[PDB]
Amino acid sequence: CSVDIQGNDQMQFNTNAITVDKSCKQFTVNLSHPGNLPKNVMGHNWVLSTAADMQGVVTDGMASGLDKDYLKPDDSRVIAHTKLIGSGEKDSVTFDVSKLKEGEQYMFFCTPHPMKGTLTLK
Ligand SMILES: [Cu+]
Numbered sequence: 001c002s003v004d005i006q007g008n009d010q011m012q013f014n015t016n017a018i019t020v021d022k023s024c025k026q027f028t029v030n031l032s033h034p035g036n037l038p039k040n041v042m043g044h045n046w047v048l049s050t051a052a053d054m055q056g057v058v059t060d061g062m063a064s065g066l067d068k069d070y071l072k073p074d075d076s077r078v079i080a081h082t083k084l085i086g087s088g089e090k091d092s093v094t095f096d097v098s099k100l101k102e103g104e105q106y107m108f109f110c111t112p113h114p115m116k117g118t119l120t121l122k
Helices: 054-064
Strands: 002-006 017-020 026-032 047-050 090-096 106-110 115-121
Touching: 047 054, 054 106
Parallel strands: 002 026, 017 115
Antiparallel strands: 026 090, 047 106, 106 115
C-alpha cells in the first residue's frame, strides 16, 4: 500500500501510472528527487485531485507561490499532497483510500511543472 516516485532535474516523474490495491485502507506515496537542482528552482510536489479539478489546483497554487509549496492553502480539491522538494530531499504523503470514488478520474501532478500521471484503483 505504497509507491516510491521520483522527480528529476528534467521535469520527469519516473512513472506515469499509480495503481492502488482495494485491500488498502490508506496509501502512501514516497516522493524523492534525484539530481542536483535546489527547491527554489526545480522543486517538485506530488498532488492528487480529480482530473476536472487539476487546472484550478495548479492555477491557484502558482498564485500562492513557493513558500506555500505552490499549493493554495486548505484547497478542498486536493485529496492528498506532498510538500515541494529539491534534489536529495524526500517527503511522503498518506491518504484514506475510501476518498477515491467509483467512476471518478484521478490524476497526480506537480503544480509548477508539466508533469502528470494517472492514479487508479486496482
Ligand atoms: Cu515539478
